[PDB]
Every structure is written in structure tokens, then in C-alpha cells.
Amino acid sequence: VLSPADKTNVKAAWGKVGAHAGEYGAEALERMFLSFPTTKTYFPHFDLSHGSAQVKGHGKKMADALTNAVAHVDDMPNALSALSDLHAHKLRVDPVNFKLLSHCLLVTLAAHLPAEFTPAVHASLDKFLASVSTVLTSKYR
């Protein structure tokens, strides 16, 4: 369960990410690809090199999914439902990989939002990303 404080911090930090949301998503993915190379196997057809249009394209799509989760934070399961089906059924993404990407998303915000990344906001962001990850792994059949 996400606390009213948590929703407030996540909203505030996403508001401060602003129009960089997409670029931030791209950077999180690259951080993940470099730091945890096992994750690369889900994207064999992507060019994963620095400045890849596909990575960038994916960074925006992933970031948009997160803002949609934020905007509907009280019913994430419904909002992320199609995405949950995709990640668990079709792609068969390992639940561990959600922890690795979540960490890298935290690192990315930390690296871009010096004022916003307080211990509290960090804690709230972490629970948000765990919540999103729980929904995205809810459909293992």
C-alpha cells in the first residue's frame, strides 16, 4: 500500500522530471544494460549502443507507462493491465529484472534531481517502483 505521503512525493518528483521523462527512461535502460548485462537478452534486436534510437524510443514508452501509473496511482492494476499481460505472458520477463530496472530508474532520478532526491522521496519512489513491478509480474500463468 502506498501512503498519502508517498503519492505526494512521487507526484512531486515526476512533476520535477518534467519533459525529460522520455530521456530519463532511455538513460535508465542504458544504465541497466551496462550494469546488468543479463537483461540485454530481452532486446536482441535492439541496438543497445549509446544514442540508439530504439533505446530512446523505448525510454519514452516506458516513461509514459510510469506517468500513467502515477496519474492512476490508486488503480495501477487496471492501468498497467495490458502491460502486465505483455511482460509476464509474451515476453516472460524474470521478476528479478524489475528490481534491476527499478534501481537504475532511482539512480537516474538521483543523477538528475539533486534537490528532489531526499531520503523520504527516495523511499517513496522505491515503493512506487516496487508496486509497479508487482503489477507487471502479476500475470505469470
Partner 1 sequence: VHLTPEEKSAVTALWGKVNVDEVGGEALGRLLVVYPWTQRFFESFGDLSTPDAVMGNPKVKAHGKKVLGAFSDGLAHLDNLKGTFATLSELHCDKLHVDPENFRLLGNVLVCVLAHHFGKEFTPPVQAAYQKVVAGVANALAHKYH
Residues of the binding site for heme b: 87
Residue 35 φ/ψ, nearest 5 degrees: -75, -35
What residues between 102 and 131 interact with partner 1 by CB under 8 A? 103-104, 106-108, 110-112, 114, 117-120, 122-123, 126
Q: Are 140 and 11 in contact (CB under 8 A)?
A: no
CB of 46 to partner 1, least distance (A): 15
141 touches its own copies (CB under 8 A)? yes
**From the annotation, which residues make up the binding site for O2?**
58
106 touches its own copies (CB under 8 A)? no
Chosen from its own copies, ligand HEM, partner 1, none, partner binding at 3 (C-beta under 5 to 8 Å by type): its own copies
Burial label for 6, CB within 10 Å (0-12, 13-18, 19+), is: buried
Among residues 89, 109, 86, 104, which one has the least CA distance to residue 39? 104
As a whole number of Å, the CA-based R_g of the chain is: 14
Binding mask 69-108 for ligand HEM (x = CB under 6 A): --------------x--xx---x-x---xx--x-------
39 touches ligand HEM (CB under 6 A)? yes
H or E element in which residue 125 lies: helix 119-136
3-state helix, strand, coil split of the chain in percent (to 5) is 75, 0, 25
7 touches its own copies (CB under 8 A)? no
Footprint of ligand HEM (CB under 6 A)? 39, 42-43, 61-62, 65-66, 83, 86-87, 91, 93, 97-98, 101, 132, 136
